Amino acid sequence: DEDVLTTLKILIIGESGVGKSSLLLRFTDDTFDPELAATIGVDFKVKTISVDGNKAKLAIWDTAGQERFRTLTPSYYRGAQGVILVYDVTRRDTFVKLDNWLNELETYCTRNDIVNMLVGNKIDKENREVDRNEGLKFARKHSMLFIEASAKTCDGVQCAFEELVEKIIQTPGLWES
Ligand SMILES: Nc1nc2c(ncn2[C@@H]2O[C@H](COP(=O)(O)OP(=O)(O)NP(=O)(O)O)[C@@H](O)[C@H]2O)c(=O)[nH]1
Ligand SMILES: [Mg+2]
């Protein structure tokens, strides 16, 4: 790790079934599992990437969307530097519930510079319920980055993680050791 600038804690949150774990598997393993199992507790994965000429090691916390499967919730948020909030563009309920997730995240307000990225997933699917502009409006109202993605067809996945990391490195007090 002699060329690694820093290790960043990235949290992935959002309702069950929106594709959190699939976005992560696409990013770490370059594959998709149509039958991926629901996450129980937290699934931690490490991946190192390069953005703007710097290598950042990502410690990624993929959490269960079902509240009954979450434990030590304060631990999930503690130290997070980037947060990816995910909704399913085919399920309006998962988009409206992002307000509950944001309320939770805002109780872990030690710093006010954590970088948030909103991802509307499953854009490959039929029967979209949330349009892109609606997701963009929410992101901008909350000063978040925004991307639409498909873990299934790869659209937007790499950018969701790269754009988040680029911005975290450009917010110095956030990662300086
Ligand atoms: N068509 C399509 N299906 C997807 C996409 N992303 C995930 N899925 C599917 O949607 C289902 C749930 O995905 P998953 O990644 O497990 O969701 P999750 O947000 O991690 N759920 P949990 O919070 O319960 O762990 C899975 O069967 C998976 O194949 C996508 O971009 N497009
Ligand atoms: Mg999962």
Side-chain angles (χ1 to χ4, degrees):
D1 70 296
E2 316 213 316
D3 54 0
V4 174
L5 174 61
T6 189
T7 292
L8 304 177
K9 178 172 174 171
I10 307 298
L11 174 64
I12 314 182
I13 61 181
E15 290 299 289
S16 185
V18 302
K20 298 183 300 298
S21 304
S22 295
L23 290 162
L24 183 56
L25 179 67
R26 172 62 70 185
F27 177 63
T28 60
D29 288 48
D30 304 309
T31 197
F32 176 75
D33 182 351
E35 313 298 332
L36 194 62
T39 303
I40 300 172
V42 64
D43 190 33
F44 177 93
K45 304 285 182 175
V46 181
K47 183 181 178 61
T48 298
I49 57 166
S50 182
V51 304
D52 298 323
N54 303 305
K55 283 182 57 163
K57 177 168 194 183
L58 310 181
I60 309 165
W61 289 61
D62 173 23
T63 69
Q66 295 175 95
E67 175 281 304
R68 63 200 250 242
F69 293 159
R70 299 167 75 222
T71 59
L72 296 177
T73 302
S75 79
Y76 296 171
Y77 295 93
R78 182 184 183 71
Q81 289 157 300
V83 179
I84 301 177
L85 295 94
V86 185
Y87 65 99
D88 175 350
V89 308
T90 72
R91 298 192 291 136
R92 174 167 293 283
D93 57 351
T94 70
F95 173 71
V96 167
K97 287 275 220 169
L98 244 21
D99 277 287
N100 300 121
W101 283 101
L102 191 53
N103 280 330
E104 182 169 81
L105 180 56
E106 291 185 337
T107 69
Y108 301 97
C109 45
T110 293
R111 52 246 293 222
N112 60 6
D113 61 354
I114 290 169
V115 183
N116 293 151
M117 158 69 73
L118 180 67
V119 177
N121 190 223
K122 311 207 192 184
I123 63 175
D124 62 284
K125 288 188 89 174
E126 284 171 31
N127 307 306
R128 170 182 286 263
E129 288 184 356
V130 184
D131 68 30
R132 187 172 196 285
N133 294 336
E134 192 171 355
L136 179 67
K137 285 171 184 172
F138 182 94
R140 294 290 172 79
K141 178 169 202 164
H142 296 288
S143 298
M144 308 186 165
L145 300 172
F146 179 65
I147 289 283
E148 280 201 337
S150 173
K152 185 173 175 184
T153 66
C154 298
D155 303 45
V157 182
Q158 186 70 19
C159 290
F161 286 91
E162 289 184 353
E163 293 176 17
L164 172 60
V165 172
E166 288 169 4
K167 184 167 168 170
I168 294 171
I169 293 304
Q170 303 160 342
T171 310
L174 190 50
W175 60 270
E176 289 327 309
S177 53

